Structure formats: C-alpha cells, structure tokens
C-alpha cells in the first residue's frame, strides 16, 4: 500500500530534480539559487519549457509573445464583474480560467506538447492580469490594463497598485515567481498530469492544478503561514503557542514537506527577502517559531518549507494576503505547463488501484424487508 | 517506477471492488448487476455514501433532500446564458460548477466527510438541471425548471425534452446512472482525491474530476464510440475499417480497460438496453465491430468497456450525443463524492516522485555569452 503515493515514481522527467535529504533543487540542471540570483521569471519559464537558457533573440521574442498576451478580452472582464464580490481569489481565478477555456478556439482540443506550450503562453501571461484586477474589481477599483513594457513581475505590481513598483519590489516579486515556478510532481502538478493523461484539454488540466494548489496544506499554506504569525501576536508568545500546537497535534503552517527532510532551498532565499522587506515584528515571531521547529521537529524530518517566509515578503510589498496563493499560481503555471507537455509526449493514462476491505456478494434485499 | 501507476495500490477502500480478471463489479459489496436490476440511482447513491441500503424512511428523506436541491439560482442561469453557445457541454458544466462554488458560502471550506456529503447532495442534484438546460438555452429553448415529484432520471429527461419520459426511458436512464455511478480509482476519481488530499474545497475537487472525465480516452469515449459507429457507416465496411484502424495504430473507442481484461460487466448490461432501445443499423455496426475485437484483440486483454454501448441507449431516448459525457458526469458525481469523503477521513497528501534523467550543477551562462 503506497499511502500518499509516497516514493512512487510515476514517470521519467527532464524538467526538475529535487534532493530531499540535502535540500537541493534544480530547474533543468540549474540550481534554484543560481536562477534566483541571475535569471528572471521569463527566462526561467523559457528554460523550463524548452530545456535550455535562451539566446538574446530567443528571450526577447518570447518576452514579446507573453507581453502581447497579458490582456483580457472584454467578455472576460464582464464575467469577473459578475462574480460574487466576496469570492476568494483562488476560486475566482478558477472560474475565470475555466471561462477563458470556453472562449478559446482550442478550449476542447486534446492536449499535445506543442499546443500545450502555445496555450501556456496565453494563460501564463494572463494570470497576473486576472489576479490583480480581480482584487481591484471586487473592491470597486478601476481595471488597470497590463503595461507591455514592464516585466511580468513589475507589471503585476503595476496593475495591482496602479503604479509601477520600485526596483527592489520588481526584484523580490520576480524572484518569488522563479521560486514558485516549478517543483517536480507535487500534488497540484500531479492533478494537472492526471487530467492530461486522459488527453483532456489544457484548461481542464490547469484547473485541477488550481484546485489542488488552493488547499491549506499545499499552496494555501502561504496564506495560513502569515496569518499564523499574526495569530501568535508577539515574539514572547511563540514558545507557549508552539507547545500547545504540538500537544493539539496542530500542523505548523509553512513547515514540513513530503520530499525535503531539511530546510527548503527556496525557504532560505525567501527568508533573506523577508528579512529585508518584511515587517519587523512578524519576522521576529516567524524567526522565533522557526528556531523551535528546527530544535524539536528536525529529527522528525520536519523543517521550514517554501510557504513559510514568502507571505512576509509579499506583505512588505503592499500586497493583500488574500492574493498570496494566486501569486503561487502565477508562478507555478510555468511548471504545470512544462509537466503537462512532458507527460503527454509519451502519454499513458494514470489509473492506480485501491485495496477493497469489506464483504462482497451481499444480496439485495427489498426495501420493505429492511429494518 | 510505475508509468501509469498500473497496479499501484494507494489506499484501502470499502466503496467499490473490481475483479478485473473475472469481470466483476461491486458497490459496497453488492453486484452492479443486482443494483442495475432492482435499485435506483438515488438508492445507489445512498448506499455509496453511507455504506448500506437505506430504510423506507432513510430513502424517502434522502430523495426529498435531493429533489429540493435541483433548482438553479437566477444568477447561475444568467451565467449559463452568458457562455459562448459553441461551448461543449463538459466545458460549460465545468464553468458552471465552478461558479456554483463561488456563490456557495462553503465554497472555500476545507473538505471533511460530513461537509462533502452535504455539498454533494447539492451538486449531485443540480448537474442534470445544468446539463439539460444548457442544451435548451444554447439552442433558443426556454429554461425548464426541475419537477420535484420526478425521479432524478426522469427529471433529467423531462427537463431536456420538456416532456415527462415513458416508464421504459426512466428505467434505462436510471440504470445508466447506476452503471456510471462508481468505479474505484479511475483517472477522474484519482484527480478528485488528489485535490481533496490538499484539503481544498469540494468544488475544486469535483472540477478536477470533470476535467479528467472529459478526456477522449476516459469518459469522453462514450461520445467517441457512437460517432465511430456512425463513421464506419454500415456493417459491410466494419472489417475494412477495423483493420485500417489496427494498422494505423488507432484506438478502438469503447474497447480496452486498465483493469478489466475481459468484457466489462457494465458493458454487458448496456448492450442489452442498446439492443432494446438502440438504432438497428448502428447496433448492427457496433455488433460486427464487437466481434472483430473479441476475435483479434481479445487475447491482448482488450475487451469491450462501459462506454461502448451506452451511447446507443441515450441516442434511442432522443438525447443529443453532445451530452453523453455530461451524463457520465451526472452519475459519477456519486462516486467522486463517496471517495472524497472516505479518503479525507484519514487524509494524506498525494504526492509521488518523478525519475530525473538529466544532469545537475549546470552553471548559468550570461545571455550575451550564449
Ligand atoms: C507538506 C505536508 C502536507 C507533507 O505531508 P506528509 O509528507 O504526508 O507528512 P506526514 O503528515 O506523513 O508527516 C509525518 C509526521 O510529521 C508530522 N508533521 C508533518 N508536518 C507537520 C507540521 N507542519 N507540523 C507538525 N507536524 C507535522 C505529522 O503529523 C506526522 O506525525 P506522526 O509521525 O506523529 O504521525 C505536511 O508536512 C503539512 O501538512 N505541512 C503543514 C502545511 C504546509 O506548510 N504545507 C503546505
Ligand atoms: C482504457 C484505456 C485508456 C486503458 O489504457 P492502458 O491500460 O494504459 O492500455 P495500454 O496503452 O497500456 O494497452 C497496451 C496495448 O494495447 C493497445 N490497446 C488498448 N486499447 C486499445 C484500443 N481501444 N484499440 C486498439 N488497441 C488498444 C494499445 O495501443 C497498447 O498497444 P502497444 O502494446 O503496441 O503499445 C485504453 O485501452 C484506450 O485508450 N481505449 C480506447 C478508448 C476507450 O474507449 N477507453 C475510455
């Protein structure tokens, strides 16, 4: 019985490698550290989909395809304006992406590698526009069209705030997208691949990813983690909160990982940005709790994961907490697209089994003879 | 390393048992044959969710809860009227279910066994209303609200046709839903459980199921199968077509199964109804092709599956082919809901691995140096 499908390898891959015991991560052979420091989201997406770093012209041309794909048709904006104003961002994105599929000429076409990347360019480019403007529309703010000249990351901050961001913000945001871009076969990527394995359409597949990423013990933890520090209140109450949580068997959000049994390499980088951009008190609370996790839960293999420090970074960039998981989606769409294309290149329906326990051969008894 | 996860047993279950070698199927211990013969969709759903056949009182109350949840809010119908008329039913259903989730006060709540059944009653009851009326709306017909006194199966036909169906149709439709209700951990159910395993909401999980079921080699084959019979054209062209297909490495729709290595027990039952309600010629064509498969592919473990004959049955009840996969969804929502509730009762995130075959440690080269 492979519960949680733990350590079950479902296919070969050339996209990303994770070293859980050592806490190392590579995107097509390049460490996440190197990319976070020297690359950009656009270049990383290019690398993830085509397997190598782009040339000067390859990157400029790809950046151009994306830029001209950020806009949303008027009917899409109309549907956004029709959503219940209280709809949470991930759920709103889910519906909007589904509607985008309905209006796309290729919305029902069975996935193939080439077509997946084509649609991927459009959806990847569009998510930030949907997320930022959903926040605006749900709050009675004016819709802000994308700015072709800004980077993917800068343009998101631009549409959301209605003003171009400072260099340090474009950098933190871009790095955040790179760090969230890809992570092998996590739950959301598995869901995307499972839908793709039936040769369904691109949108149906990405929607499964969105649904899975939304979960509080998956991508949703980015929001639960920061709310958790806020719940603790002050650095002085951390310890008492920690032992109560352990006693209660409560999950410490932002901690633990199916693969990493040591500090998440992405968490190291996020902590660095949270240190320089995050709220001093919250960072203090987070660091205090972090030490307790390392002290008592490390032998168990529970360390800090990617969703622990990222919220503080986004919060420091004046981004509402309700949009953090959608930002994870803004980045992960790259990895989802890469995996969907890779899996269906040599497709095989994903269909496992369950071990039935119970009686078989029970005889039907008319309802009137039942007690 | 298991490409396809063939024979990988992820967890234990008490919902459904499949005997792939013997071609047997049980829902909570009861053969699908018996349930298709003596039960009803509503009763089968109750069995699937709560694990036992209901009492007179239990069934009546359940049927009451379902019937009272069939209607759609004005805002939902409005969204339906806003979708492109050329949207395929499964794609339309997907967007509508997502929206229903948006307007639901529990649309973001982490799944729990009790909550899953609660929401399950609502979505299960609304699918036929959405499906039938999507067809009507997209074609200029008036919206037809659900009729409480009708059974789930009869009500679907009533809304779609604007006319209550004859007893024989209600029966065939009811049986179809029962046969599609549950099937262990198939691709769509795995997708549903995977989303559920992150403790996401009910709607997000079901939508993953809808997206997967949609695939042409999964639930979508029910539409592909009937179109394939019509494509062949006549019992005389079958053999010809059959071999051109085998040589072209084209898959025969309605045939093959990851588990069943023999005739699908559900396909047996569907054939019977297809024989009684299906188009003569189409049936003849399907029959000749069925023989060629049992002849040439039989040895390879490739037999007839549940999606081979159902189309003909739906076609005989004047149901547009474009709605067949959504009908599969209408029934399978029961199994999706059952597994969602059962799995999260002892949750563990579903997260496997991939065998990386590339190199690591590559050094980043400045773009100008490329
Ligand atoms: C990421 C995550 C889903 C991985 O789940 P998994 O690989 O199935 O891990 P398990 O639940 O089997 O963990 C094994 C043990 O460590 C504990 N554990 C793992 N995460 C924990 C956490 N975040 N806080 C406290 N204990 C944790 C489990 O309760 C279990 O304890 P046990 O040995 O007494 O039964 C999980 O660690 C988690 O829920 N983290 C919190 C939310 C988060 O930040 N993730 C996004
Ligand atoms: C149901 C289904 C998805 C199961 O997939 P699976 O368990 O992974 O089956 P495999 O691809 O491993 O089958 C092994 C071989 O049988 C063949 N096979 C399976 N179904 C076939 C079909 N319907 N027509 C022709 N050959 C078939 C495959 O092409 C494969 O050939 P190979 O050995 O030369 O590679 C598959 O049989 C199928 O695509 N059927 C057609 C669509 C259908 O009606 N199903 C829904």
mmCIF file of C-alpha atoms and ligand atoms in Angstrom, chain A residues 348-349, chain B residues 216-218 221 250-258 300 302 305, ligand 2:
data_model
loop_
_atom_site.group_PDB
_atom_site.id
_atom_site.type_symbol
_atom_site.label_atom_id
_atom_site.label_comp_id
_atom_site.label_asym_id
_atom_site.label_seq_id
_atom_site.Cartn_x
_atom_site.Cartn_y
_atom_site.Cartn_z
ATOM 1 C CA UNK A 348 -0.233 6.722 -20.507
ATOM 2 C CA UNK A 349 -3.442 7.177 -18.533
ATOM 3 C CA UNK B 216 -11.476 11.094 -25.117
ATOM 4 C CA UNK B 217 -9.719 8.036 -23.695
ATOM 5 C CA UNK B 218 -11.634 8.320 -20.439
ATOM 6 C CA UNK B 221 -15.031 7.820 -25.231
ATOM 7 C CA UNK B 250 -5.766 3.991 -33.967
ATOM 8 C CA UNK B 251 -7.507 3.055 -30.714
ATOM 9 C CA UNK B 252 -10.914 1.422 -30.950
ATOM 10 C CA UNK B 253 -13.171 3.608 -28.825
ATOM 11 C CA UNK B 254 -15.266 1.722 -26.305
ATOM 12 C CA UNK B 255 -12.683 -1.053 -26.075
ATOM 13 C CA UNK B 256 -9.874 -1.674 -23.595
ATOM 14 C CA UNK B 257 -9.581 -1.010 -19.856
ATOM 15 C CA UNK B 258 -6.762 -0.672 -17.341
ATOM 16 C CA UNK B 300 -4.396 -8.998 -25.650
ATOM 17 C CA UNK B 302 -8.572 -5.752 -24.878
ATOM 18 C CA UNK B 305 -15.855 -1.322 -21.898
HETATM 19 C C1 LIG C 2 -8.967 2.341 -21.491
HETATM 20 C C2 LIG C 2 -7.508 2.676 -21.899
HETATM 21 C C3 LIG C 2 -7.240 4.193 -21.665
HETATM 22 C C4 LIG C 2 -6.543 1.873 -20.960
HETATM 23 O O1 LIG C 2 -5.165 2.228 -21.202
HETATM 24 P P1 LIG C 2 -3.921 1.284 -20.674
HETATM 25 O O2 LIG C 2 -4.366 0.344 -19.518
HETATM 26 O O3 LIG C 2 -2.698 2.146 -20.283
HETATM 27 O O4 LIG C 2 -3.617 0.442 -22.029
HETATM 28 P P2 LIG C 2 -2.177 0.328 -22.792
HETATM 29 O O5 LIG C 2 -1.917 1.582 -23.678
HETATM 30 O O6 LIG C 2 -1.020 0.064 -21.792
HETATM 31 O O7 LIG C 2 -2.519 -1.019 -23.705
HETATM 32 C C5 LIG C 2 -1.486 -1.879 -24.218
HETATM 33 C C6 LIG C 2 -1.615 -2.057 -25.723
HETATM 34 O O8 LIG C 2 -2.991 -2.325 -26.055
HETATM 35 C C7 LIG C 2 -3.471 -1.466 -27.104
HETATM 36 N N1 LIG C 2 -4.886 -1.099 -26.887
HETATM 37 C C8 LIG C 2 -5.567 -0.709 -25.709
HETATM 38 N N2 LIG C 2 -6.849 -0.266 -26.130
HETATM 39 C C9 LIG C 2 -6.842 -0.381 -27.390
HETATM 40 C C10 LIG C 2 -7.944 0.020 -28.224
HETATM 41 N N3 LIG C 2 -9.023 0.552 -27.639
HETATM 42 N N4 LIG C 2 -7.798 -0.171 -29.558
HETATM 43 C C11 LIG C 2 -6.634 -0.712 -30.025
HETATM 44 N N5 LIG C 2 -5.582 -1.116 -29.244
HETATM 45 C C12 LIG C 2 -5.671 -0.917 -27.913
HETATM 46 C C13 LIG C 2 -2.565 -0.219 -27.031
HETATM 47 O O9 LIG C 2 -2.491 0.557 -28.242
HETATM 48 C C14 LIG C 2 -1.224 -0.776 -26.499
HETATM 49 O O10 LIG C 2 -0.524 -1.243 -27.665
HETATM 50 P P3 LIG C 2 1.177 -1.481 -27.646
HETATM 51 O O11 LIG C 2 1.462 -2.778 -26.728
HETATM 52 O O12 LIG C 2 1.654 -1.711 -29.173
HETATM 53 O O13 LIG C 2 1.843 -0.153 -27.022
HETATM 54 C C15 LIG C 2 -7.205 2.243 -23.406
HETATM 55 O O14 LIG C 2 -7.470 0.849 -23.629
HETATM 56 C C16 LIG C 2 -7.869 3.119 -24.530
HETATM 57 O O15 LIG C 2 -7.281 4.183 -24.914
HETATM 58 N N6 LIG C 2 -9.044 2.687 -25.047
HETATM 59 C C17 LIG C 2 -9.740 3.413 -26.116
HETATM 60 C C18 LIG C 2 -10.650 4.498 -25.511
HETATM 61 C C19 LIG C 2 -11.700 3.867 -24.612
HETATM 62 O O16 LIG C 2 -12.838 3.563 -25.027
HETATM 63 N N7 LIG C 2 -11.462 3.936 -23.338
HETATM 64 C C20 LIG C 2 -12.053 5.009 -22.470
#
